[PDB]
Design a binder for these strands. Sequence first.
RNA 1: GAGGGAAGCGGAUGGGGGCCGGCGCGCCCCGGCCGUAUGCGGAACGGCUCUUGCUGGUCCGCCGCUCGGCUCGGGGCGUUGUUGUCGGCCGCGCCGGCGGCCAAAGCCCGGGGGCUCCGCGCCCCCGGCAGCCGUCGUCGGCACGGCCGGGCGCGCCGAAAGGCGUGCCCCUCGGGGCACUGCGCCAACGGGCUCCCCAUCCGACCCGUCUUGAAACACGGACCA
RNA 2: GGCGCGGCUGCUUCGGUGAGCCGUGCCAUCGGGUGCUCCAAGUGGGCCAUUUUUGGUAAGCAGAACUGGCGAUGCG
RNA 3: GCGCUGAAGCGCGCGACCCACACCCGGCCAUCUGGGCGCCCCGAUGAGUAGGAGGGCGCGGCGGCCAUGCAA
Lengths: 133, 49, 219, 163, 49
Amino acid sequence: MAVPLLTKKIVKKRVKQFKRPHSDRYIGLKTSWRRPKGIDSRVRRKFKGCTLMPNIGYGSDKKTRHYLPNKFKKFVVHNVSELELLMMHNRTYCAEIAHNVSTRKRKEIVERAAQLDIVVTNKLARLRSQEDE
Amino acid sequence: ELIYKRGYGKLNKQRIPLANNKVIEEGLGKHNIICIEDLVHEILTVGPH
Amino acid sequence: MAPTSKMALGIKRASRSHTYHRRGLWAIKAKHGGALPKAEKPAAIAEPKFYPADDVKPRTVSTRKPHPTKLRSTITPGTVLILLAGRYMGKRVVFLKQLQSGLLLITGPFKINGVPIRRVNQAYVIATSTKVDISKVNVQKFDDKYFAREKKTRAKKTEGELFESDKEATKNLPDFKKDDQKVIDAELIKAIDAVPDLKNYLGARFSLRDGDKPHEMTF
Amino acid sequence: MGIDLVAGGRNKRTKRVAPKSDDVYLKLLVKLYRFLVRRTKSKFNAVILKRLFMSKTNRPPLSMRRLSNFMKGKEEKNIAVVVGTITDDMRIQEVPAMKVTALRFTETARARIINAGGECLTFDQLALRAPTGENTILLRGPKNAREAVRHFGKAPGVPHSHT
Amino acid sequence: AEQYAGEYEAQDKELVQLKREARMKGGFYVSPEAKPLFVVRIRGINAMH
RNA sequence: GAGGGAAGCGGAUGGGGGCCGGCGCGCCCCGGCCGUAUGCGGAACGGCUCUUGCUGGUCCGCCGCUCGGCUCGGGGCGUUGUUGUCGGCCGCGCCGGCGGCCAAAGCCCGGGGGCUCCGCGCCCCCGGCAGCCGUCGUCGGCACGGCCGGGCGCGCCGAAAGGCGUGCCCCUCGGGGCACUGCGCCAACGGGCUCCCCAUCCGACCCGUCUUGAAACACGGACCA
RNA sequence: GGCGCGGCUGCUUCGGUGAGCCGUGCCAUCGGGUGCUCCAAGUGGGCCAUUUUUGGUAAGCAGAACUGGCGAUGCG
RNA sequence: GCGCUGAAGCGCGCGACCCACACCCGGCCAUCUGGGCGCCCCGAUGAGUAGGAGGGCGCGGCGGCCAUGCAA
């Protein structure tokens, strides 16, 4: 079930990557996607090789939606308190420590998480506060 | 070997089809017996309703 | 359609017989379905899980159906396999793997000093008289305990059993070497002699186990 | 595919929980009906539900007069279902009894009906004690009445001929 | 369907031979056919009224 | 990344290289700790009643009296990728039967006619009869591939598949169909992305606008914040 | 929709008739392609093809009719 | 385009093949059929400029709630 659903968004994609058209030939003209607006537009004509436009059908399977490729659901954790909920999940969820949370704060969360048995992103990021290879 | 292949369901639901179960036991009918084998004769014999 | 008509024509018929043997014993299999079974400590959680039992039993049966059948199309025994040619007697190998048909892995033991193993598109294999229930799958390459010698003495007994048939049968001995040379392979003639097995198969079954798990391999 | 089937995508979609019901107490009432409706005999409560979602063009004042001639003892003082509200506008010495059920009443209408007979009931107490919703009269509109159909714009709007 | 044809052999005897070997076709009697239909739409909705 | 011989809206699509972040269960013995039932002693609760009352909590403090368990470790034992398959769906080629054209090409046998009147040879018709034909319809038998996914048991023998309860009936041969409780629910083995190049297409720029029609030899922009 | 019973009426001799009306009883090949209300839009300058045209030598002309498409429709 | 000629022209028949996003089939996104417990499920149709109607993302300062900060 889940394994197959995770694989159906992640190994297929869709990675066309929807870049704004001809973003490359002016630098300033930004990468962020804009709908090809005007009639002649080849992309607008919704041709193949023209890079697909965004539409609802493009969408991922719900069962696979907002998951990390690991297939854990990420939960943003500001502090220790969020940890309780995360601990309940444990298997289901991975915890991601917000960038803001400070180095002095980060330590308590990390140890608590382990005890919680919710090792995920947080470990990586704590070795990332230490230094390191 | 077209009713078997390509038949589909009625209103009071959606369509779920003319597959095994759901023509013997399901399908409406007030005229006669609605079931597959019986219906194919009744339609091409062209009688009452 | 010709196999598939036979299944219909109760429905069940043996499965209408099956109930009966329980009905005959006496009065039963509603009570035993409801009253049973186990439970109650445990730790944690939903207990969403699982297996053994009832589905697994059709999946093994179901998996058994290509298995004769692919041999009826291609003819032979199964594994375990002998060098016909090469050395007059000599030794025994098991088809653990197909890279393909033709590219095959033929096997053995090695735990102290060891023994090779080959992947070949050929060199030297014609089959014997044993069947299992795999086709031609197991592997990486494992075995070991007595078994350079045992597998091998198992070889000698088959090589004697074969060598006599190679005398009676062949066109002669020199292209039994071309047949052994081939090793895709296959269809033409298969079943000569070498009677019976009961040991040969027991030996083959161990060989399959040995090229499986759990020895020498774990850290 | 067909063009028929595209037109089939173009039916309605009437469907609406209204944009807000700021009253929480109405907001819970309007949901209750889809659980209760397919779970009892009550067609009426299922009708009240649409008419307490959608519109103000739909929400009824009913006067005590507009109950009063219209209930008149020949469906013998049943339960009168007023989707929106009662209003206070009559004097006769009003109703012959009566169990009246509505979202809202004015206080004068509340006072005058209960001192004539019966009870001014709230729709939820109605759902509790009349869950079947039978022996009940859906009485009634309006916004459909004389003032204002298309009679809008300035000085209007008219029989019509022109406007 | 065999009996519908079948009276047409059983009474008749003018139908096969003369008929292979000569032209015009016969007097007497004829047996009728029925028959219901199926319709599948081969051509799309582009450029027709 | 690539390069001094092969062509372009500068992307798309496929592939390699370059760069980089991530990395348990069952049992047994030893050590460790604690225990309920019942008597004590303290205490939130509850169904409910709703003045009020009755039965029913749970844990702790901690001794007595039986009789057991847990947990952290140690020691032994057993237990993400690919390929085989069972089920469904669709494709494929080949073989075979029967009925339709009252079946018939047919050939052998037997009889008559014609043409050609130079005779060969050609034709046509009818009965018995090996025979087998091209086509409609239909049924019967097999073997493969692709894609996607993971109804069955509930006593015994039998590796296996399979049969072993009994009544009915057709055939009365081999055999066949038909009838007769509930319940539950697989095998094997050990990465992303950027730029480039080659293939392929969009391709007619884009883009926006004007326009019936824009690549547009229609208009507007050097480039960006 | 049709009939009967009963009241009332009409126009056209103190004259002939039905019709209307009300009241009361009786007897009777499709398949949502769909009604009404409020408020809003670009318009309020087209094109082409097919068929039928009228003008014009004709025209990638002009100007209609009837329709399908382009405009606003990919993909082959 | 190379460019063929008892065809790689032409015509009359014919056999097998190829080839779309069509049609089927598998799995999934909106709306609607509805159904069932704030959530799940069955099947159908489902390009789009002008454009109506509806749900949502982001900016900046304010209030109540709720945090983060010597590494924002």
